[PDB]
Design a protein around this ligand. Structure first.
Ligand SMILES: CC(C)CCC[C@@H](C)CCC[C@@H](C)CCC[C@@H](C)CCCC(=O)OC[C@@H](O)[C@@H](O)CO
Ligand SMILES: CC(C)CCC[C@@H](C)CCC[C@@H](C)CCC[C@@H](C)CCCC(=O)OC[C@@H](O)[C@@H](O)CO
Ligand SMILES: CC(C)CCC[C@@H](C)[C@H]1CC[C@H]2[C@@H]3CC=C4C[C@@H](O)CC[C@]4(C)[C@H]3CC[C@]12C
Ligand SMILES: CC(C)CCC[C@@H](C)[C@H]1CC[C@H]2[C@@H]3CC=C4C[C@@H](O)CC[C@]4(C)[C@H]3CC[C@]12C
Ligand SMILES: CC(C)CCC[C@@H](C)[C@H]1CC[C@H]2[C@@H]3CC=C4C[C@@H](O)CC[C@]4(C)[C@H]3CC[C@]12C
Ligand SMILES: Nc1nc(NCCc2ccc(O)cc2)nc2nc(-c3ccco3)nn12
Ligand SMILES: CCCCCCCCCCCCCCCCCC
Ligand SMILES: CCCCCCCCCCCCCCCCCC
Ligand SMILES: CCCCCCCCCCCCCCCCCC
Ligand SMILES: CCCCCCCCCCCCCCC
Ligand SMILES: CCCCCCCCCCCCCCC
Ligand SMILES: CCCCCCCCCCCCCCC
Ligand SMILES: CCCCCCCCCCCCCCC
Ligand SMILES: CCCCCCCCCCCCCCC
Ligand SMILES: CCCCCCCCCCCCC
Ligand SMILES: CCCCCCCCCCCCC
Ligand SMILES: CCCCCCCCCCCCC
Ligand SMILES: CCCCCCCCCCCC
Ligand SMILES: CCCCCCCCCCC
Ligand SMILES: CCCCCCCCCC
Ligand SMILES: CCCCCCCC
Ligand SMILES: CCCCCCCC
Ligand SMILES: CCCCCCCC
Ligand SMILES: CCCCCC
Ligand code: NA
Length: 390
């Protein structure tokens, strides 16, 4: 076979290229949030936590990956730390993505409560806690769930390791039951499914809000036409009672209020006339409603639609991030599943292991590109930083 160093040179070169790009792109993210107070919100605190995890992939995880590819002799607990540290960063990523999804879910479901439920001070606490949990989950093998007690003597002697040392190779020291049941099923796949569920609920909530606006609008307009071709007070009375309900629902910032005050007032004026039997005065009063609608209500309606559309677009953008996370990490997990559940199967070849590893690391490059393409405030801040400071 070809000298191993030839394939190793390609591996190391690609890992270093990923490292540089992971560091540069994610530093730009952090720099942008620092510069631009418009980007300084709780959602972006999680973005910065995720960018920090991606910088740490370039600075630490990639160097550790290069090291462990050599099978160097190491004390088994030192080997575990180098093998498992990337699991801490990946777990931190998962918590940041989960926090973002729930943040956007609260923002769309209880917008009035959001700013008092979800504060910077609480966010910072949540981020600290998530990082501590990430260290505990990813370094669980250091607590004894490891293969350090069952060393590969063949490898130890061939690499000529000293006493207490192992040839530091991932699948020799990290148990596959940990990787499949604990890391993959419990710590990765369950959070990804929860995130899928939350995004689904976001899109369902936006659509139901947009439906309710459009139904209130159409209720207004249709009862306006009922009133016009009406024949008696009872008809006009009913159509106005329906308009009043529709109007109060639509309502649930000074110029906005004034507009609905004019509407409900005009409705209530036409309501008192109807009761007293004056059908034509009620019908005439109701013709006023059309200019209030055109001047005030159609403006609030289109503003509300435009806000919801922006929330849906932002939610799509963040869901893309989760989808790319999944794309980049699932191959390695699926390979581990074959290793573990199919002992009759040939192990995935080395070249495929290293491709899957490289793909996992490429995840730490992509997010700054998604922000730049999808989120105008990031794109514009990146432009300013690049022009001015380069
Ligand atoms: C990637 C680049 C663009 C940016 C990187 C930035 C800088 C700061 C990287 C820092 C790298 C270091 C943290 C790397 C640590 C390397 C360690 C893990 C090597 C360990 C090797 C070792 O133990 O020696 C081998 C022998 O001692 C062994 O065989 C016997 O014990
Ligand atoms: C995020 C997504 C939208 C795009 C990501 C792009 C992905 C596919 C990365 C592209 C890189 C590849 C085209 C090149 C990688 C080739 C490497 C993995 C070959 C590995 C060779 C090998 O087996 O070397 C290691 C061993 O031979 C042994 O010597 C240990 O070092
Ligand atoms: C501020 C940052 C850069 C500090 C980085 C510290 C890192 C590189 C240190 C902390 C713990 C260290 C490990 C401690 C124990 C061992 C076992 C030994 O047999 C081989 C080296 C090895 C595996 C060390 C490699 C380097 C190491 C991983
Ligand atoms: C998430 C998206 C990108 C799908 C990726 C699926 C990948 C991970 C799948 C596609 C086909 C799969 C391979 C098909 C056959 C074998 C041979 C078996 O003896 C070891 C596992 C191995 C090598 C599988 C590992 C995982 C694999 C490479
Ligand atoms: C995509 C997300 C939502 C689900 C992930 C599906 C994973 C867990 C599935 C997809 C394909 C599956 C593999 C398909 C084939 C085999 C070979 C069999 O001898 C053992 C089970 C094994 C190795 C399966 C294990 C579980 C597996 C890897
Ligand atoms: N299975 C696996 N192996 C490795 N590296 C070792 C690749 C390899 C596997 C077999 C071999 O004989 C020589 C090298 N890194 C790995 N990282 C992960 C991982 C991280 C998150 C999910 O899986 N899994 N994983
Ligand atoms: C992109 C900057 C330069 C790229 C680095 C060149 C790669 C050569 C280093 C070779 C060292 C090999 C160490 C042992 C590997 C054996 C693993 C089986
Ligand atoms: C908001 C700043 C980020 C906070 C990061 C601090 C993390 C400190 C290290 C975590 C300690 C947990 C120990 C559990 C694993 C022990 C295994 C030997
Ligand atoms: C298994 C699910 C994975 C599906 C991937 C979802 C991503 C869709 C891509 C469309 C939008 C991408 C915007 C910019 C792409 C830049 C990529 C570096
Ligand atoms: C070998 C390094 C892999 C880096 C691959 C990262 C892909 C990022 C997408 C960039 C697309 C830019 C398109 C501009 C027109
Ligand atoms: C920053 C304050 C300390 C955080 C306290 C974390 C609470 C941990 C509760 C149970 C630990 C479960 C870890 C799984 C091994
Ligand atoms: C054989 C080396 C084992 C070292 C483990 C000692 C540290 C105890 C871990 C406590 C974890 C607390 C984290 C908060 C959940
Ligand atoms: C999302 C579905 C996840 C469940 C996958 C569990 C698969 C277990 C595979 C059992 C294989 C045992 C091998 C027997 C020869
Ligand atoms: C990065 C994940 C996608 C990899 C696509 C390549 C699939 C080819 C798999 C063939 C491997 C068969 C080797 C078994 C001996
Ligand atoms: C409000 C913006 C603050 C930016 C914080 C930057 C944190 C960077 C930590 C990266 C750690 C990698 C080693
Ligand atoms: C704007 C507040 C966000 C602070 C997040 C910073 C996270 C830094 C953790 C560094 C751990 C890297 C090993
Ligand atoms: C006594 C040699 C093996 C011990 C492994 C040390 C790993 C944990 C210490 C690193 C601290 C992180 C900054
Ligand atoms: C600048 C960072 C380069 C990566 C460091 C390489 C570490 C390889 C150690 C080899 C162990 C025998
Ligand atoms: C280290 C400061 C940021 C420099 C910006 C250079 C271009 C960023 C490239 C993104 C992959
Ligand atoms: C575990 C991740 C959940 C983060 C929730 C987001 C903020 C809610 C504060 C009440
Ligand atoms: C593998 C399941 C996670 C996908 C979630 C992405 C939502 C578009
Ligand atoms: C239902 C799970 C049991 C299969 C375990 C197989 C381990 C190789
Ligand atoms: C990028 C593909 C790696 C090489 C595949 C075949 C090597 C035997
Ligand atoms: C200059 C970096 C060399 C990589 C380790 C052999
Ligand atoms: Na990450």
């Amino acid at each position: 076979g070809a000298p191993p160093i030839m394939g190793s040179s390609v591996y190391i070169t690609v890992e270093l290229a990923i490292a540089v790009l992971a560091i540069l792109g994610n530093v730009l993210v952090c720099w942008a949030v620092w510069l631009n107070s418009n980007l300084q919100n709780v959602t972006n605190y999680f973005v910065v936590s995720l960018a920090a995890a991606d910088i740490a992939v370039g600075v630490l995880a990639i160097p550790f990956a290069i090291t462990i590819s050599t099978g160097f002799c190491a004390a088994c607990h030192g080997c575990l730390f180098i093998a498992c540290f990337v699991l801490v960063l990946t777990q931190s990523s998962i918590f940041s993505l989960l926090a973002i999804a729930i943040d956007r879910y609260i923002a769309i479901r209880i917008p009035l409560r959001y700013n008092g439920l979800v504060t910077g001070t609480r966010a910072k606490g949540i981020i600290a806690i998530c990082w501590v949990l990430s260290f505990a989950i990813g370094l669980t093998p250091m607590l004894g769930w490891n293969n350090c007690g069952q060393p590969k003597e063949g490898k130890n002697h061939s690499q000529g390791c000293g006493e207490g040392q192992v040839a530091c190779l991932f699948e020799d020291v990290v148990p596959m039951n940990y990787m499949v049941y604990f890391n993959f099923f419990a710590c990765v796949l369950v959070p990804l499914l929860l995130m899928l569920g939350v995004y689904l609920r976001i899109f369902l909530a936006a659509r139901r809000q947009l439906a309710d606006l459009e139904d209130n609008w159409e209720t207004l307009n249709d009862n306006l036409k009922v009133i016009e071709k009406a024949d008696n007070a009872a008809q006009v009375k009913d159509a106005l009672t329906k308009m009043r309900a529709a109007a109060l629902d639509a309502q649930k910032m000074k110029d906005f209020r004034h507009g609905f005050d004019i509407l409900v007032g005009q409705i209530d004026d036409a309501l008192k006339l109807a009761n007293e039997g004056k059908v034509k005065e009620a019908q005439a009063a109701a013709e006023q409603l059309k200019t209030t609608r055109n001047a005030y209500i159609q403006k609030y309606l289109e503003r509300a639609r435009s806000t919801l559309q922006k929330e849906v677009h932002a939610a799509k953008s963040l869901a893309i991030i989760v989808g790319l996370f999944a794309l980049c990490w699932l191959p390695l997990h699926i390979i581990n599943c074959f290793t573990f559940f199919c002992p009759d199967c040939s192990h995935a070849p080395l070249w495929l292991m290293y491709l899957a590893i490289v793909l996992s690391h490429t995840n730490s490059v992509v997010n700054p590109f998604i922000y730049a393409y999808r989120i105008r405030e990031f794109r514009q801040t990146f432009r300013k930083i690049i022009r001015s400071h380069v």
